[PDB]
Amino acid sequence: SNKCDVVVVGGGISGMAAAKLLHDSGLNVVVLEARDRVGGRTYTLRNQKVKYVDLGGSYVGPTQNRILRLAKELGLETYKVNEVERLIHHVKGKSYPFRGPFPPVWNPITYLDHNNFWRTMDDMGREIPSDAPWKAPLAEEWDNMTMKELLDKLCWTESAKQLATLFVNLCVTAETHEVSALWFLWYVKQCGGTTRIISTTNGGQERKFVGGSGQVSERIMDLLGDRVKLERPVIYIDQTRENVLVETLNHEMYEAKYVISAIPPTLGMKIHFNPPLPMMRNQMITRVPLGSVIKCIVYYKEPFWRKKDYCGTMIIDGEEAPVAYTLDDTKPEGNYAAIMGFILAHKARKLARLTKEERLKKLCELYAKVLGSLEALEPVHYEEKNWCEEQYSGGCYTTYFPPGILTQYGRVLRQPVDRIYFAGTETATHWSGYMEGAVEAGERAAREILHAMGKIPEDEIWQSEPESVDVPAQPITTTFLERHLPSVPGLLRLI
Amino acid sequence: SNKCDVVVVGGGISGMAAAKLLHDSGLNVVVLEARDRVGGRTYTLRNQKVKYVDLGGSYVGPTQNRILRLAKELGLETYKVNEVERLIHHVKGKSYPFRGPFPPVWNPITYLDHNNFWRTMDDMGREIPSDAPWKAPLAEEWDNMTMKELLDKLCWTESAKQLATLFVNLCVTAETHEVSALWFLWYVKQCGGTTRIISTTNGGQERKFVGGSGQVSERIMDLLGDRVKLERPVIYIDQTRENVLVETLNHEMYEAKYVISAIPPTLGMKIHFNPPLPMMRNQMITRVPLGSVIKCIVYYKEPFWRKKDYCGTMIIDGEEAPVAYTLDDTKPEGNYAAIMGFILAHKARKLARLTKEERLKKLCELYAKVLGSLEALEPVHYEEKNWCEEQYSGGCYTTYFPPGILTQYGRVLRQPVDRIYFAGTETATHWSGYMEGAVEAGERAAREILHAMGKIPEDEIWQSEPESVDVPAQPITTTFLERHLPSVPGLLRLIGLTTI
Ligand SMILES: *Cc1cc2c(cc1C)nc1c(=O)[nH]c(=O)nc-1n2C[C@H](O)[C@H](O)[C@H](O)COP(=O)(O)OP(=O)(O)OC[C@H]1O[C@@H](n2cnc3c(N)ncnc32)[C@H](O)[C@@H]1O
Ligand SMILES: *Cc1cc2c(cc1C)nc1c(=O)[nH]c(=O)nc-1n2C[C@H](O)[C@H](O)[C@H](O)COP(=O)(O)OP(=O)(O)OC[C@H]1O[C@@H](n2cnc3c(N)ncnc32)[C@H](O)[C@@H]1O
Ligand SMILES: [O-]/[N+](=C\c1ccc2cccc(O)c2n1)Cc1ccccc1
Ligand SMILES: [O-]/[N+](=C\c1ccc2cccc(O)c2n1)Cc1ccccc1
């Protein structure tokens, strides 16, 4: 058996960040990676037609200081996602160009209803602790409802309900009826709220890495050399003896003092445990699916939308559109012109039966309609990735909680099992579900082990992160009117 | 590699029924079983204090003709669960003895709401095809709701909502807010409807096997000899070559023409697949958890409840009650007096924290109050089993579907993946979740392979079962008033119109 201090299961950003921290402290680490590559839910493809493209996780923004610091140390640089020109909201077959992060509403009733919906999401989130959403005062009430039920209660207009629905689908790649209200409200709150999570400028979609996000995992693998073992899916963890034994599918045996599980919670099911896991974890890892998404990038000779004062951001309502949201994927030099679109949730399941060429045609015809340009019909290249088909991801972007699961099982996610500690973006308390959360969780799980070894004190397990000098955060502001305008039922009670 | 025609993964009733049919058709089968025993979600404990006791699946009834035929062919007998004396409905801290399958209701408004609740469950059920629930006309609308949301709309009284909530918790060991309304309505309809599923006499809980249900899997193991491999958890299935390769955790390798997966759907996650599963199954097996239950059996010197004219059946409402449902578990000879109780859904999670001794104490104190009997505080013995802790079950009784899953993923549940066919009770069309469903699914998957090998025509894959001559099924009937009495909103509509 191959002996070390710590076995990290998974070479995504979380496992790699944990292995780097432990290695830098002088421990002997092995990373066991199921795939022939590192990066997990990040994947940068290179070819002459795209140069590079992020087919998985890509965007970083202000307040994501851990991923910005790790990336910067590895020698990576960011560029700004194009948002110079106007965004488009496509509603009932027509494009309404706009500026600022929220699509505007002109009907006064619809205005009140939209304003109330976003405000209520943040008002609710203020009562949900980031590190313990199950301790929200109304935790059971909110956990025993879907986001569909909450939206049915909150939204007096079909206008607000359809945009709120698009918001849920885009944020967590799942249907409003699939997900706990408590979990979704926590999810928004722990990215800093609605403005911060939906914003390009001054939010989660502000920036991409020059050369792709896959370089974070690749360059940590560079540092660690042959400590990273590719095509070693873990099948068996034995904790009955003095050292932990980890076995891979290719029959190799690893022996360590501790283990970091840096895999999506439900992919814990692929591992046979001795002794069996405690009951709550045993059932938890069956209750925590990942969402459904195809990430699709259509390439054009030029960023032609910019000539019409469109930035390439499209918010597209309605069942018929295959893609509900797009960003300009053009490289900083203005070349490799491209539109990134997501095929989300039930549409990812529905449209996966088509050919690649059939999806390209549907996307080009949608983009031609929304951008009002025949140039959208003349793509020069297409890349896509269906994350639903990934045995060692389970989906993307992240794990969602169905109704009732977070209050019953949420406590178990980070709870150590003997000498196994739990990393993965799912265990983060800030930008859980993102590359930032992957870094937070890996580093925390690594410091839990340093503390178990007596190397650091308890108060050093969770560590704050200084603000990026390169990507500083501006405050989220609200207007007097946004804060005090009544809801629709509010305006009724006042009549 | 050990060579055969068919590897069966799982030595539950489903896997063993498959293996037996294939073996009887003259094929070479191997059963790879993870545990040191067959039976899976059935488990008969034997010791001198209890003689035998079912800690997993136990009850069989009318219309479950496949498990009754299989058990009869293996030399097993049934006996009737005690329903001679009165049942008890315990609500707001008081016990109301009754007869017949449903706890009665005297308040006329409450009576209409209760009658409308059960009636509407079966009415919606008749819209849902047993073999394709996602083809129901309102499949999408029903699948996008929880059972909690459906009870909130249907029940105009708290009385009906509370009883309906207990019915869901007991039937599928899950909370109303956890389960799809479509899936639950399907689950009840594919058992023959509300009356058949809830009933002891004339329903699912009518009988048990003399000597325990574990004998079904054990006796098929006896027929199969060394073809059954215990402590062979399957870790890897390879379909990239001419024959399928099946690898176990002890590094043994099995080579076969075909595989039957006879394990709970989510436990497919414990197997590494080459090539990868198709997308829809890849994601479905992360979306289908099992329910939560502790089965608890408290033993007494005598079945003292019978002397107060209680059969031992208790339907117990309220958060404080650790157990919502009990049945007499006394042996047919009248000895090893016992009460069987289920701790359901969130209470299986909450009370798992306690010791065995603390759970025994809470159950005795509950039983003493409900039966109005201090004898209930004098147990002689206790057995229990928390199915939440089983690595190779994932829960009990069965797989439930959360909102949105049955319409998006339900169709791939028994869709073959190249040379892998799917058994297990979850893939049944009649009494899915039960031992009956395990037999139907196992025999159906076996016959799918017999068809693939050209040994039978397609019309022999699905086969009807002759009615047991030993456990005949009384039909389910309604009275004129049950069929036609209005709902509470129906009555308010009548009132509205008269008054106009
Ligand atoms: C898929 C995706 C994700 C995504 C997104 C868009 C798509 C299409 N957009 C994002 C974005 O713009 N910005 C951002 O910050 N995040 C975005 N996401 C999510 C993001 O990619 C993830 O949050 C992050 O990558 C998660 O990292 P983490 O390290 O937590 O997890 P992982 O990448 O899934 O890595 C797990 C690794 O474990 C290996 N594995 C799995 N099972 C085993 C076993 N049994 N043995 C050994 N290794 C195992 C995986 O193969 C993987 O490498
Ligand atoms: C647990 C339970 C179940 C139950 C019930 C009460 C409890 C507490 N009450 C029932 C009742 O009164 N009447 C009835 O008909 N059913 C009742 N249920 C449900 C019933 O027990 C189940 O429907 C039935 O036994 C399921 O049979 P099936 O054959 O489909 O599935 P299984 O019993 O889970 O068997 C699966 C076997 O597979 C092995 N396994 C799991 N993973 C692997 C791997 N990777 N490799 C090899 N083998 C594996 C399991 O160990 C098991 O033996
Ligand atoms: O919410 N919005 C953007 C969003 C959110 C979460 C993401 C996660 C990963 C990758 C992304 O590109 C994400 N984009 C836009 C929006 C604004 C107003 C109404 C509806 C929708
Ligand atoms: O539904 N009832 C019993 C039932 C149903 C399903 C089962 C499945 C497995 C094992 C069992 O013991 C089961 N018992 C009684 C009842 C009647 C009226 C209201 C609420 C409850």
Curated annotation (Swiss-Prot), chain B:
Top class in the EC scheme: oxidoreductase
Marked site: Important for catalytic activity: C155, C364, H381
Outcome, altering K385M: No loss of activity
Record bears the keyword Acetylation: yes
Effect of C4S: No loss of activity
UniProt modified residues of type N-acetylserine: S1
S-8alpha-FAD cysteine modification, residue list: C396
GO molecular function, one term: electron transfer activity
Membrane topology, from the record: Single-pass type IV membrane protein
Outcome, altering H381R: Significant loss of activity
Reaction(s) catalysed (UniProt annotation): a secondary aliphatic amine + O2 + H2O = a primary amine + an aldehyde + H2O2; (R)-adrenaline + O2 + H2O = (R)-3,4-dihydroxymandelaldehyde + methylamine + H2O2; a primary methyl amine + O2 + H2O = an aldehyde + H2O2 + NH4(+); benzylamine + O2 + H2O = benzaldehyde + H2O2 + NH4(+)
Effect noted on mutating C191S: No loss of activity
One BP annotation, GO: dopamine catabolic process
Assembly behavior: Monomer, homo- or heterodimer (containing two subunits of similar size). Each subunit contains a covalently bound flavin. Enzymatically active as monomer.
Family membership noted in the UniProt record: Belongs to the flavin monoamine oxidase family.
Name by which UniProt lists this protein: Amine oxidase [flavin-containing] B
Organism the protein comes from: Homo sapiens
Record lineage: Eukaryota, Metazoa, Chordata, Craniata, Vertebrata
